[PDB]
Amino acid sequence: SLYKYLLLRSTGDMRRAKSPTIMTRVTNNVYLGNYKNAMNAPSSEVKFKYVLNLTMDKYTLPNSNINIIHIPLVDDTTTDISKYFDDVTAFLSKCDQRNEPVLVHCVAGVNRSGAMILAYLMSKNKESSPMLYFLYVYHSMRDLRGAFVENPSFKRQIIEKYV
């Protein structure tokens, strides 16, 4: 019934894209969100230690002792993001090992952040066929969030790295 789900999703049964709303917890400590979720991170009962800001501009969070890490990524179809995969997944892995919650976000929480989260989940897959796991993670996250890594260059780079 998961095979049926993936096969229908993969042969023309995708929904129209919608903007994500609430944050999505993806692992014990790692969360995916948009700019509003980042602005709300200092007041979240999750107790974030880090925020990974993938937008083009640095910002600060006044009351907060959160450590904001800035990695500006370009959401277009020519620019490389693969040079960041290993450093980003190693940092996210460390947060999960240390139980230090981290929010990964861009502006809409679809492409730049979605791609780093997809890379992390691929990097943690030890038991499944990478092709199957990619389809499962892709379709399941898109259905949960409304839109997820719509950028086809980003999907291509993740496939080249992990599949």
Amino acid in the structure at residue 116: M
User: Alpha-carbon distance 130 to 148, whole Å?
Assistant: 18
Q: What is the DSSP letter of 147?
A: -
What is the number of residues in the chain? 163
Please, are residues 149 and 138 in contact by the beta-carbon 8 Å criterion? yes
**Nearest to residue 123, comparing CAs of 150, 152, 96?**
96
Q: Which one of the listed residues 106, 108, 121, 135 is annotated catalytic? A: 106
Q: Does the annotation mark 95 as catalytic?
A: no
CB atoms under 10 Å from CB of 52, counted, come to 24
Which are the catalytic amino acids?
106
